[PDB]
């Protein structure tokens, strides 16, 4: 049996089983040429996780590794939580306990990563905003069961997420949406789902939010830890609150599903007065071992 | 970090990624008393596999091990494919390359297992039959897109499966059911789904069938390798064909989803002229390593 190293890394947590897993296969010592896309696809389909990734030798010395990223259904050109977990796994696979930055090679091109005391961070490639009709809004309010404190909007962050705010964290936490109504409305509206959030008003850390991500149209009624969602939330918050300094949003998620994800979304004011969107989290290897491959 | 051995075993295959996985946690050297049901549940929810199992010391010397069996949502008192994969994992965990029989302890009581050249076998605890209305039948034919060669029936095998036969293996393989119609009809009818099968008519091995299992009402539009389904198919075939000798049904499944499961369902004529239903398969460990636990 050929076996290569394998780690299943829990992303957005330091505590096992509280985050969102990514299976990461170490193909750093085999020729990517000699591994078919169908083989890769089959492995991702079999693990049945949101994504399964594969580490390969980079195309050029300026990158530390190439990452191929797969869902059970297709290859993605990029995703956030797999990037973070794969970075953690790489460090471990290569016995590296000192790197503070790395550059990942993937379909999207170069993705610089920083590591700060376990906090792994990259710039989100996409975070666009777009207003939604008041009709859409009223219907979504119907589906969620709550009035929003600001107009929701459509955020393009990879997936098509509606972001909507409620009065506080508790209200968001305790929401009980009608999932079939949401699947109906999102299907009708071509959206993946809704990101619901509310502020933790008496938190020591400012700009702390509770978030929830609901995607019943793709049969993820609730995503327990949703990285593309925190970028949406970040980008939304910028439009609504129009921050002038670099602002960190501290997002907690997943407690209704008995998880506990932590995501740090940075709205970074660049030297050109432009804005960039960073996502960061801890990750912890939960399953460590090897996997049989062809 | 406490880490205990872990194997992810592919059931109904000798070839990796072709079967149906079960995650198997080795808790044989820790006190089951000291591990909460919520902990176990959380691990099963996090792996997100059909089942996740845990090996514990048995309650009495007459058993080789106790198995606790979990879906992402609940503990089951029993299931077939997890039993087979967990048996394979146990053998490996305890460096046993010679056992030909074992007895598993679980909620259902004692479950004798035999191992024959890698073929792992147990008696299915439940296999009841029940006729269905011709109205139900005609509708299901509508949902599948094919006429059946015999009356379908309801088989109680754990899940509530309709079993239906078509002209041959190819016809079954090439079926393209309307999944939403099936979800509608099964939801209405309180069934989990349909097991579709057809005979491989020119096969060297007699009583070879291609099977497919569709359970869209529980969001498994197609189960790629379905052990409870092969027991249904076996029990159905007994009623329809009324076999007088012990008959093996050789079931192949999963090619439409790019898998290749093999299940051996035995209709065993007992000394009392009664009938028992055995299920058997190979299993292969695909991920081998350890898992962090609390």
| Stated length of chain A | 294
B152: tokens are 């379908």
A21 to chain B, closest Cα gap in Å: 7
d(CA A76, CA A230): 19
Experimental technique, in short, is: X-ray
DSSP H or E segment with residue B290:
strand B283-293
User: Resolution in A, one decimal?
Assistant: 2.0
| CB-based contact, B284 to chain A, within 8 Å | yes
Which residue in chain A is spatially nearest to B284 when comparing CA positions? A292
CATH topology of domain B125-282: Diaminopimelate Epimerase; Chain A, domain 1 (3.10.310)
Q: Are strands B52-56 and B160-165 parallel, antiparallel or unpaired?
A: unpaired
**What angle separates helix B179-189 from helix B134-144, to the nearest 10 degrees?**
160
Instruction: List CB contacts of A7: < 8 A, sequence separation 6 or more.
Output: A23, A24, A26, A89, A92, A93, A285, A287, A288, A289
A199: tokens are 């502020």
Partner residue facing B287 (CB), from A6, A38, A219: A6
| DSSP for B201-257, written as a single string | TT-SSTTEEEEEEEEGGGTEEEESS-HHHHHHHHHHHHHHH--SS-EEEEEEE-GGG
H runs (alpha helix) in B129-199: 134-144, 169-174, 179-189
Q: How far is CA A17 from CA A79, A262, A284, A285, B71, in A?
A: 20, 13, 9, 10, 15
A18: tokens are 């509280």
Which of A32-39's residues contact partners 24+ apart within 8 Å by CB, and which partners?
Answer: A32/A56, A32/A57, A32/A66, A37/A75, A38/B258, A39/A293, A39/A294
Instruction: Specify whether the CB–CB gap between A10 and A283 falls below 8 A.
Output: yes
d(CA A195, CA B97): 52
B187: tokens are 């939801």
| DSSP for A170-221, written as a single string | HHHHH----HHHHHHHHHHHT--EEEEEEE-TT-SSTTEEEEEEEEGGGTEE
B240 to chain A, closest Cα gap in Å: 35
d(CA A114, CA A104): 11
Question: Is-catalytic flag, A51?
Answer: yes
For tokens 């796994």, the residue is A89
Torsion, Cα of B26, A9, A92, A29 (10° steps) = 90
d(CA A210, CA A276): 22
Which part of chain A is CATH 3.10.310.10? 1-124+283-294, 125-282
DSSP H or E segment with residue A88:
helix A80-93
d(CA B9, CA B50): 12
- CATH 3.40.50.300 correct for B1-124+283-294: no
Tell if the CB–CB gap between B290 and A291 is shorter than 8 Å.
Answer: no
3-state secondary structure B83-118: HHHHHHHHHHHCCCCCCCEEEEEECCEEEEEEEECC
Instruction: Specify whether the CB–CB gap between B222 and B229 falls below 8 A.
Output: no
Instruction: Specify whether the CB–CB gap between B217 and B193 falls below 8 A.
Output: yes
């Amino acid at each position: 049996t050929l076996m290569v190293p394998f780690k299943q890394v829990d992303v957005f947590t330091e505590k096992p089983f509280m985050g969102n897993p990514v299976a990461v296969i170490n193909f750093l010592e085999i020729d990517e040429n000699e591994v078919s896309q169908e083989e890769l696809q089959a492995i991702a389909n079999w693990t049945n996780l949101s994504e399964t990734t594969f580490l390969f030798k980079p195309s050029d010395k300026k990158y530390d590794y190439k990452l191929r990223i797969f869902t059970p259904r297709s290859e993605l050109p990029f995703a956030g939580h797999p990037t973070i977990g794969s970075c953690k796994a790489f460090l471990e696979f290569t016995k590296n306990t000192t790197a503070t930055s790395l550059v990942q090679e993937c379909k999207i091109g170069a993705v610089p990563i920083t590591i700060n005391e376990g906090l792994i961070s990259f710039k989100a490639p996409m975070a666009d905003y777009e207003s939604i009709s008041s009709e859409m809004i009223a219907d979504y309010e119907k589906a969620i069961g709550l009035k929003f404190i600001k107009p929701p909007a459509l955020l393009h962050t990879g997936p098509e997420w509606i972001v909507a705010l409620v009065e506080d964290a508790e209200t968001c936490f305790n929401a009980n949406p009608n999932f079939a109504m949401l699947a109906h409305q999102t299907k009708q509206n071509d959206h993946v789902g809704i990101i619901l959030a509310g502020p933790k008003k008496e938190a020591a850390i400012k700009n702390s939010y509770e978030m929830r991500a609901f995607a019943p149209v793709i049969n993820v009624y609730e995503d327990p830890v949703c990285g593309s969602g925190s970028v949406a939330l970040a980008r939304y918050l910028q439009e609504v609150y129009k921050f002038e300094k670099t602002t960190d949003i501290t997002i907690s998620e997943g407690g209704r599903l008995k998880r506990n994800g932590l995501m740090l979304a940075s709205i970074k004011k660049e030297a050109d007065n432009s804005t960039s969107y960073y996502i960061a989290g801890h990750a912890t290897t939960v399953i460590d071992g090897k996997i049989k491959v062809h």
